[PDB]
Scaffold this active site. Structure first.
Site, PDB file in Angstrom:
ATOM      1  NE  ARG A 146      10.410   4.155  38.935  1.00 49.24           N
ATOM      2  CZ  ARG A 146       9.346   4.947  39.022  1.00 49.24           C
ATOM      3  NH1 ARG A 146       9.491   6.153  39.552  1.00 49.24           N
ATOM      4  NH2 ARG A 146       8.136   4.622  38.593  1.00 49.24           N
TER       5      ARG A 146
ATOM      6  CG  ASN B 142       2.311   7.744  33.515  1.00 51.00           C
ATOM      7  OD1 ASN B 142       1.725   6.812  34.063  1.00 51.00           O
ATOM      8  ND2 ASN B 142       3.605   7.764  33.256  1.00 51.00           N
TER       9      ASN B 142
ATOM     10  CG  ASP C 172     -16.769   6.715  37.283  1.00 47.93           C
ATOM     11  OD1 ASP C 172     -16.699   6.118  36.191  1.00 47.93           O
ATOM     12  OD2 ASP C 172     -17.341   6.178  38.226  1.00 47.93           O
TER      13      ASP C 172
ATOM     14  CD  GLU D 202      -4.400   4.745  30.129  1.00 47.17           C
ATOM     15  OE1 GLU D 202      -5.348   4.513  29.363  1.00 47.17           O
ATOM     16  OE2 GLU D 202      -4.121   4.051  31.102  1.00 47.17           O
TER      17      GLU D 202
END
EC number: 4.2.1.10
Lengths: 150, 151, 150, 151, 153, 151, 151, 152, 150, 151, 150, 150
Positions: free
Chosen positions: B23, B79, B92, B104
């Site tokens: 996609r 990710n 958390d 990240e």
């Protein structure tokens, strides 16, 4: 659209970064801006390119430098610093040259600081945005520019 | 308090990333998640380390895997995909191990997309956040874990 | 119309609560989740009842368990943890049984923490909400369930 | 630095709570403020302690009272009622004695009511906040002061 | 893009819909989820198709199922229930297959309820949203998939 | 259930209204609070009632007086002045007696002033709200109490 | 009240709908408003009913027609178009007849457009709201009215 | 600067008020709009004045009628109904004649209803605003206009 | 319409300031409210004026006192403390006397505190606003009142 | 695309503009709407064109006239006045004819007035927007239309 | 770490202050910027110190000057003018030297003006903030720097 | 004051407008800033006037120029570009001369762009604001200045 081989990577540093290494080292490290320049030169040379590393505390000066990059450089790695959060003019300067690879770098993790530092005008135009990776983030910036101009 | 030599880097992939390559290629590329896993293997091997690469569409399974990392892995590259915007629970979970390096990664530049995608709960804990650098941001993430682990 | 004598009180714990005692002790303390279950077992035994003490990191599994409690349990003490702030699904599941006593418990005082933790979806259905009373809050929850279910 | 054995617990009640039991019994119940005071007396007696139960419609009087506690009481159980939502002065009074155990109690579930009742200024200083547990919530308040003063 | 003749319509039900008919009948009716399934079988059959009717309380499972629909089904009728308001992951799952006809259905009129229920992430991808038409809106969803699958827009 | 004939209408006035007639005459007029009282006695007398007219700068005193009305008066005509915008305590006090007719009166057109004066907590409980009709708004308030207490 | 066999279903179309089929075909299709009316007549005929189909660019005229429906029609299918987002007046017209079944239809998916289009005032009164099902939404609207009229 | 003796008070009623008496009697009462008009006649007559009582569901017709009042009437009592919340046009129309006394009336207490009903555009121009006093509010409206027209 | 020679400056102190010196000394110092009064007197005396120094924890009392300041004092120095953020009544009390010089003083720098402390109703009427200059702000306040009354 | 030579330029004036010249002269001046119409005619004749000047207080009538302009005019100069802030319907009417040149004019500088006047729905469709240039802003509108309709 | 005796106080004035005295005297008075420098020289002379008084319309120049003060001056009195509301860069420059006493001064009462003037980025770093005390506010700035540097 | 006959109209152009004609032609067109200067010269000549046409990427320079206009020019036509959205300083510079006619011009229709571009600080001072009329909007600017100075 110039190659790394044919034109330098412009490395633009915003306000207060001239004092890198002197203040809040937990946040900004003990490395100076000259130290970061050497990191960039090294990264760029492994791809056969060079860098044009500059710093200014003046918004208009950075805009002026961005326009210069449009003609003479293969991409821009920019740490807008405080101007990330307030400068529409810097954003619009980067928007004047569509094709040019642009990578935004923040030494500090802006998302862990005050709520007004969370938003960056440059991020809607930067191809990539690196934050909170220290001075290593500039190396990432050069690598991504290398991959994009490639 | 583990080095790359002693344990793998956990590479955690959130929902819909199993379909990478099929996609919106202008945004996500033509590389598959299998291709991303192969890149991470090589990137970690450059530092003498290894990866433990996982993907799930379940927020809870991601939390479960973060807890495992606390005891078995030398860092996490995550990710969070859609869960970046919705999951306090994953935030958390990352907050339960203060010393573990966390980076990240976002394939796309989430700051160019809809406004609800601009905020990431994971960014308040992650050591570093890399967005819009394509699958190359995973290589960046591994390099940042290698640097943080190495000091 | 289900007393403590007829069915166990379900004590439901949300994500990350399995690591209680290892992290941020100023906020959460140094008691473990097992210590919490022991405090609940004891409080329930003093009112002639028992507890069914569970923990999951999965929102869907919490919902499944809330559906189970409607049929098999006399009430629910729930510390939803991070799901307090994000789960409309858990709120809705508690709303499928009107008459079941429900008490929401937070070990930390969520009102002293970040602004996103200040709101709980569960609080608009929970009979009572106990926050910042430490692990003692679970004993207050059992005690409120005993009072209501009585 | 006072214990339950050496000084009473201050139970402070804000505006309109003098009318408990005559109004909105769905929300507040049929118990009166005297019934609440009896609950507090009983709960404190189980820890060998005493209570100083007070009610006032005046914000300034509550402030004055909070100042008296610093010196003479072992902790405060406070039901600020409407002042929960409007009074920075009560919040600041409570902030003048950092070590004093303070537990906030709401009879009603303020989170099920109007949006302006969702926020309480007192909750940022209170060690604990009990809401919607009926008058039983005062019993919890006293039990938590006993725990805090005993540690 | 599969036709109704060649692949079932997936009907996906979110959290708490397993309890339909037990609770709040003013809002949700007295029909159960098995009555809803029967209504969908009937409506699909009338256009020569079939349904694959499923329910889960788990966001992740619904995402897994949407991915299956991508390869194996002709369209999706989804009642995301509570996940409508919180799940970017489900939205993104529906975004992974651009040509698959998707119709969002709400039994209740979410616009008459709490302000947090007025927004749905699913609605920005769905090729039609039906709300407050009771269990009859699942019939409308089936009819709309049938019209979309069949069209050559 | 108290009639005009059996009990007076309580007329309550908020902070700074004691100075009526001394300041900003374009907004508040040149009549004094005593002139307003005379207006109310007269309007009440025409229906055979009387008024108990009071003024306070103290929020808690106003609450105290509202409680007094619940048992002794047939309705309340209130001009809360600055407290309209800040007092949840006064709203809650008026809420304690459901049946009592209540009419809120502002001399000024609060909707023409600063944005913070636009909202009044008292308006969600007041049966009627009269604003910007000068001191004549008090007469309408007495007239409205008179019809409410008479049906 | 009224059944489908006793009275026609009022189908009301708001502003710019007269031009359906000329503009933005991606969003609105290439069918005309006359094609829509024929869809509605067929749908109603199948249930033994009839339709009274109208269109206006005027908010007041829409209100005037809703009032008419109250006495002469079995329900209303309404595509309020731009008035959905601005007209409290039309919402209030619909609210004047409680039991009349009302279904709101949008041809476009209003949740995919500008943020000011996401909110509809009509949606808080409408029994059901169909959006983004193209002209077939009108067919669903008639079918729903038929179900509600017959119950 | 018309006195009550020289011109009628215009009493303008907004959308849906034609149905007064048929719906929600708890909020709106069981008096019809014709009852309100008769009440307004009597109220004005107590001051020697008259009324011109009108109702429209059309925002533009209310604006047209406000323009007419500037020239022909001694004041405006307006219950804008739903247009209170939405009509900048009607606010601007009332702002076109600075000296004309205007009193806004709401039968219901709009501050107890939905949040979107809490704001009125008309209230920033209206000399006075009366809400939730039932149909009696119209009497208050007329009384206020008599006072303002009377003082000058 | 009075001068420093003819009437005292009213120095009004809002809630909790009776405790100055005993709480959070980094924020409020170790000087007492009696010390602050002594400072006000010294400063007013250098301009040949006197001060009438008061404190109350009651909003209504503070309003009553502002009303007395009007036919009696030559200006107001007001440290409204918590009532700065909440009291429209106090603002309105200061608004009834248009000519009276008013100087608002905060000992702490309210802009460095919680967000709800950033706004003061009193600042829209106050001639001048002094914040975060410690108890020395009260001398500034007297000095400004002196200059305004001049 | 109709040219200046072949079709008039519609000059559409919203509510209250019929009274231009009689009030708030510092904002709107002392010229009448008739004086504005003459300016428009003159400005158009200088380009070989003509104007079809209209005014209405009725939002629906403005819409109906926009619909006419699609079939008969070369462009529209619109001063929506109060409907600028409220009318989605007029914005959508303008959006039904993509190519028609449209220029929005405000006599007053709407940015200097109340906050609710700062936003105009027409501005997202208008090619250009002129504010605060007085009645001269209509001549600028005519001149822009001349340039856009021309070549 | 410099005292009043060993280094001048930097007084920095932001954009448009060069024009002081020529317009809006209700707000800004009729004293010139030179009149204000004289007031600062005199106040500082009375505590044995000196002033380095500057003005600029350029944000980058003001950042450059703040960096200078960090090494050569004992404290900063800053009237940021319009840059108070927009300049994160100036805030960050002041944040680079944590010990330097900083006092923010506004001639006008920014809380009585448009809502965008109510927030100042400088007030979160300034030790103190003086607003609406006219040019005299600069004297309080100097007095407060004298107090903190000692 | 000055008339068109006695002093030139200042035409001020903000950041990035130096590149007009090179980028984003759909929004900004293919005319250059020299083309825009010619249009201004032509429009002013038709009224017996002259123009002083300038561009800068520097906010403070633009402020300096506005101050010059006050003494030397009959009016300002200003296209603040990005600074419209961020510069309180420019807005304050414009407010320093109440009677100077000022007309703000945007080439693009800022209301059809991102939400941050919808607000201009300069619009609260400008006599008129022309947007989305392309480079022709400067012609309107000059015409309006001509009508106002008359």
């Amino acid at each position: 659209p110039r190659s790394l081989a044919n034109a330098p990577i412009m490395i633009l540093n915003g306000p207060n970064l001239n004092l890198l290494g002197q203040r809040q080292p937990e946040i900004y490290g003990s490395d100076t801006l000259a130290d970061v320049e050497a990191l960039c030169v090294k990264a760029a040379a492994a791809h056969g390119g060079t860098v044009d590393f500059r710093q200014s505390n003046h918004e208009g000066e950075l805009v002026d430098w961005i326009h210069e990059a449009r003609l003479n450089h293969c991409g821009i790695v920019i740490n807008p610093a405080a101007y990330s959060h307030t400068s529409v003019a810097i954003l619009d300067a980067l928007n004047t040259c569509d094709g040019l690879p642009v990578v935004e770098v923040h030494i500090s993790n802006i998302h862990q600081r005050e709520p007004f530092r969370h938003h960056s005008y440059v991020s809607q135009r930067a191809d990539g945005v690196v934050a909170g990776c220290g001075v290593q983030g500039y190396v990432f910036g050069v690598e991504r520019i290398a991959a994009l101009a490639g």
